[PDB]
């Protein structure tokens, strides 16, 4: 059992790990474009003398923290142990090696998506955004009276063909993702991979349709089996006047009884109606999840709420150092200190905390969090929340 | 088609609408209890000519707002049109009496309990509370390390019957209500109501059983007919140390398979466990509407946040009045002006702001709240802002 | 294994065929009332020896036919076997001797409601009347210009409890059951049976409302378990005016997202809407059977269609005689003949015939009914259709 | 907003309008064979200045009425308008210009099948047939001895394959739809896209087979996911031995539990049964809904029930002018009048009664048809009844 960098020959043993281990594996047609996002000793593979029982890997991603501010990010995906090889600390050593790599490389954080919420806390990955499923029973919408676009005179929005208008969903998505926290650059190879899913296929998906605005859009499609759901799998919207006038299209979608959507707590939805309760919410789940690699490079690099005071105290991340922390003018100065602690929090708890989708005092109600002083408590709450609210960019 | 305060010979017709008109209809017995809490000229009945074809009515309750003030809150409820007086502007001719008394009788707020989503935000009330079921499957929770009450020795919690700790469970809920935004005052009358409901009913609900912590109780049954479900009808921990006590005892109720509770967004309990993901959000959904009645009042009356500096603006409530608004050492000044106004707003928007649930950030995005000034916006949020979050105390 | 008129010894035995045989069993006390239907010898009971292992009996009941005409008519019920002396010909031995004592006794029909479909066809039973279940999404329905009842001032329609109204509700179910074929004459025992489930039951139904105008009433309770659709139990009207007043009421029941009714297929409800399609038929069954027991008295005692012309025919019923049958001016002559025969059918398919719900035509194309002369065909289609849509009164 | 004949420049916009607005959609390759049944200025495309925002079409039709007549009929179809742009009147122009162009051609009547049954009745359509799903339990089937074909001795109904037998079925369909009232022309290219559906698609629809008779065919299908349901896309039978003979044949589907089929209210299938309560009615809606566009030549055009005796009368179409209608010996005369109304009715309500699927009784006791003269209702009612039960031919 030795775990290295895989070689070229590793890779169709890697794919039938990969087939074995996750049902939504495209094959290795859409693995290409996946792969050219995987440094040069990205990946481990470990090997049973003969065959690969276990993979991770890492991919270069950007992504926007509060304070609008863009960090290299190691995102974790592809790990996988082979079911004949359970219990065996394969996942513990891989991503021992991973880490040392990622840290050594000089990335200040990592993120994953879960498989399951109760593996990644003890590698020191906290859950840092919130997916909200809303669904809206479209036959009961209207829109109240002070919701934006409801004018005389043309709509702003059009139906299109996704592949189409390619140049113009990226240049909207390029502005979306560089000003709301959890957004991730999308490389040209994923936006290939995106405009092939939009096409139906035999026995699987229909077709999905865009409604285009110059603020927005709204990739959806109708679901497999429930013909009167439309699914909106993506909707990018730059300002207010976008989202509402994307939704009064949706909203217009009469063939359907339902419309639902994958989006964040603050979403405005419910807002926008006469009645905030036919957005119903029917599921949650956590999104993205943060290693903080580099515990003060990634608390000088986020900005802070200007609203709170000057302050300073000393937070102590488990087995990650002590810091004297000073926050003033929405900006961070995070230095080695020998001082008291005044905080004390494990690794994962600082990554919820990170892109403000948790509160302090929250996790400081669940002991997740120590300190002795309810202003200082307060103070962090603050601070450490998002102006523009934490949203999920895509799945890797 | 008259609108009058009923005499106790309207009573009787009351009943039969109530009992046509709500399904969860106890009957006259506990009828009593309730009309306890209405005060004289609370009610208005309409009758045609002859029967009761619309009633309306208040109670009068005591809120808990930020900074812990205790607010008298006139208590909508018992409202009724009769299936066969619907679309005639009977609901809103008992609403605008009642509103005129409960303003007169000098009431700064009013609050109610939503049938439909639809209704009310047109008489100026805004949800205000977010009710949040939780759902835990029980067989796979176990406590995180950092978890409070984990260690060796006796438990602080005891299995008990209600009835027989009447005294206890109240001196804790008075505690908790009057130091939670959204606790109401529970008098002996409604006391008298739950403990009787906490017996079983034969071919209805099951025998309700008590967890007691010194700082804490949960009152669950077993569901009707999924018989591996615990349905938590009330949790109130005054301390973490009582929440997380209470929870490692109902995840000790090993013949069930899960435990739902109704509980609020910032609810711990997720943060408690190895796995956040085994608390699913399987419901949410609005909880108490608030009317202001008197904007200066209810404004001056609670507490904003200290961590925000001192500022001012112009508030204007559409049709509610325009104030000159001084926030500063989370204590607010509300004077009448004619100075222009810098925000705009309905007065059920107000509602919504005013014990911290919704940020005034959503509700703009959404153009429920204009202004033209986003550094204002931010500084309403942080203010407006709750640091013990909202919960819902009991409905009406 | 012997044939008899039951003593008042064997009644408790065959309280226990009942209890074993129906669900629906009441047991002995509401048993009473629908006894005092029974004439002397309208029983039969089959003892093994000792037990009653097989029962059956007739009501003396009035049935109005086509033409407001009120028939004598032998309502068979209380029919079992014991499970233990099945495939004996219990049920052929016993309709024998009943239908022989009818006969004799001198009524022209027989009726009952069947169990199973593919039992009474063979013993002369042919289905005459359709049940029709219609369920409204009320959340939907609006009513179409051309309704009645739609104007300013006050509704004609109270809600109230049955109850008390009893003298009002008896009066109009006179008044429609002496108009309407299939109408039966209630008498006093059966009202104090209808009001007595009018009641809520201890883990039961929910308690009933009456909607009463001057020309009509709805009775309606809320599912037990549905707790967002209500049954419409029975709506009887005299005039078209009070049955669209009474669903405008049923309609107007807000808390309701469904209301339900067994009803007939002509029941105009569905064309009182601007969209016909939200009153779906859930569910069509058999109502009433009919066996016709004298072919003259029953040919001759109803009115015909005074639309078609006079004509004159030889009809034969299979071993229940020959007649030469002239229909004109809405009224047959029936006497007996053995001039060739025109029209052959068996027993069971003049029953379904007689009250209008089934075309000669129809039961001609699948061979049930034979004659080589379509004119003739199209002639008693026309004569046997009635005026007034036959309905189903009440089960028994 | 612009509203114009399509060019062939315009089609490709409204495939994407068609493939957005319709799940059922085909795509263009079937598209073709459609557009072969639009004449000329058959269709009206909206643009947006640009695109397409709403579109609708008619195409010619063949329609067999009472009397066995056959009417050119304009058929309703592929009416979309873009979410974009709902609630903008552009439904009504569309309507407004094609009914103008349908009227100046010279087509009497217009016909359309309805996505929602809310929509058309303000156009001037009534539902003019009804759609009714039997589903057989076909272990428990046993045919009534009376049943035709239960003779020793060769079936006459032999097992197919649809694709080899084209000319057989051409020759059936032809037959049947020039003899039943809704029946429809069926043109080569729709016989080409039956043929292309009755193969098996790869993820979709199982192979369908064919039981094929000298005067009558089924095709049927089992259901894609329902392994133990047959569903019959379409049964023709000329001849009630025909009908009886392939009945006959899909119970003897002994791998089947049910067979499941789309036909008519009068479908006699029941009564061939020893059990008529095994073919259970499951679903009813509205089938092929008729805009009468020239109220004296569709009158005039049908045939009408011989056994009524001759009677004049004076109907009001609203806004479709005012007529003396003089009706017997089967036939109609329909001559301008000012003379007094003694029947009024919207013309939607003449559609609903024109192919005898309604009753006159039913449509007056709703108030959509007002007369006041009982007599003249049964006359009317007895008339424009059909002696061959309506059926609906094929959706378009
Ligand atoms: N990284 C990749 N992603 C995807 S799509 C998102 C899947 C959802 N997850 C399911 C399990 C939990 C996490 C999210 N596809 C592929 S294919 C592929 C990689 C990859 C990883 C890079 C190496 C080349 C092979
Ligand atoms: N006010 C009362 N409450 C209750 S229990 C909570 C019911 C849930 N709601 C269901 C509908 C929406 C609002 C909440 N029971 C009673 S009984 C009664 C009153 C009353 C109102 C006071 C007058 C005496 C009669
Ligand atoms: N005749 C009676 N009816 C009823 S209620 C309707 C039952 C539905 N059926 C269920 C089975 C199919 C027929 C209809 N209850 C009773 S109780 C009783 C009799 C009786 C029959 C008369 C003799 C006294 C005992
Ligand atoms: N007219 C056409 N029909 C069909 S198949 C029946 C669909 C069911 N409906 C679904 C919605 C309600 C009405 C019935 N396919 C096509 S494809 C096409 C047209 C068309 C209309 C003619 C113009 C060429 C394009
Ligand atoms: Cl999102
Ligand atoms: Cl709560
Ligand atoms: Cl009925
Ligand atoms: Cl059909
Ligand atoms: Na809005
Ligand atoms: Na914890
Ligand atoms: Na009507
Ligand atoms: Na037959």
């Given at each position: 059992v030795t775990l290295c960098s895989p070689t070229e020959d590793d890779w169709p043993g890697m794919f039938l790990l990969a087939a074995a281990s996750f049902?939504?594996?495209?094959?290795?047609?859409?693995a290409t474009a996946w792969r050219t996002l995987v440094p040069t000793d990205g990946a481990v593979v470990v090997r049973?003398?003969?065959?690969?029982?276990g993979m991770a890997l890492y991919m270069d991603l950007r992504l926007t923290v509060p304070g609008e501010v863009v960090l290299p990010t190691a995102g974790l995906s592809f790990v996988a142990v082979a079911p004949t090889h359970r219990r065996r600390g394969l996942l513990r050593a891989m991503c021992a090696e991973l880490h040392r790599r990622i840290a050594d490389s000089g990335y200040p954080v990592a993120a994953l998506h879960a498989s399951?919420?109760?593996?990644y806390g003890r590698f020191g990955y906290g859950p840092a955004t919130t997916l909200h499923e809303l669904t809206v029973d479209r036959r009961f919408a209207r829109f109240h009276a002070?919701?934006?676009?409801?004018?005389?005179?043309?709509?702003s929005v059009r139906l299109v063909r996704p592949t189409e208008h390619r140049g113009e969903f990226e240049a909207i998505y390029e502005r979306w993702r560089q000003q709301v926290p959890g957004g991730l650059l999308r490389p040209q190879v994923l936006w290939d991979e995106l405009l092939a899913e939009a096409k139906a296929a035999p026995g699987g998906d229909r077709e999905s349709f865009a409604l285009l605005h110059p603020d927005g859009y709204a990739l959806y499609r109708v679901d497999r089996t429930d013909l009167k759901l439309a699914r909106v799998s993506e909707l990018r919207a730059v300002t207010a006047d976008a989202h509402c006038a994307l939704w009064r299209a949706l909203i217009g979608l009469?063939?359907?009884?339902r419309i639902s959507i994958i989006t964040?707590?603050?979403?405005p939805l419910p807002h926008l109606?006469?009645?905030?309760?036919?957005?119903?919410?029917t599921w949650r789940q956590d999104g993205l999840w943060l290693r903080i690699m580099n515990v003060p490079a990634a608390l000088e690099a986020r900005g802070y709420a200007h609203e709170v005071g000057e302050f300073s105290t000393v937070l102590e991340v488990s087995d990650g150092g002590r810091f004297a922390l000073k926050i003033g003018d929405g900006r961070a100065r995070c230095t080695p200190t020998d001082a008291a602690a005044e905080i004390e929090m494990d690794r994962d708890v600082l990554g919820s905390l990170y892109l403000g989708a948790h509160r302090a005092s929250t996790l400081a109600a669940a002991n997740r969090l120590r300190t002795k002083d309810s202003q200082l408590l307060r103070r962090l709450d603050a601070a450490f929340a998002s102006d523009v609210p934490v949203q999920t960019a895509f799945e890797f």
């Open positions: 049902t939504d594996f495209i094959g290795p047609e859409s049973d003398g003969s065959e690969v029982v399951e919420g109760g593996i002070d919701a934006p676009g409801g004018g005389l005179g043309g709509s009469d063939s359907m009884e964040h707590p603050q979403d109606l006469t009645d905030t309760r036919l957005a119903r919410t």
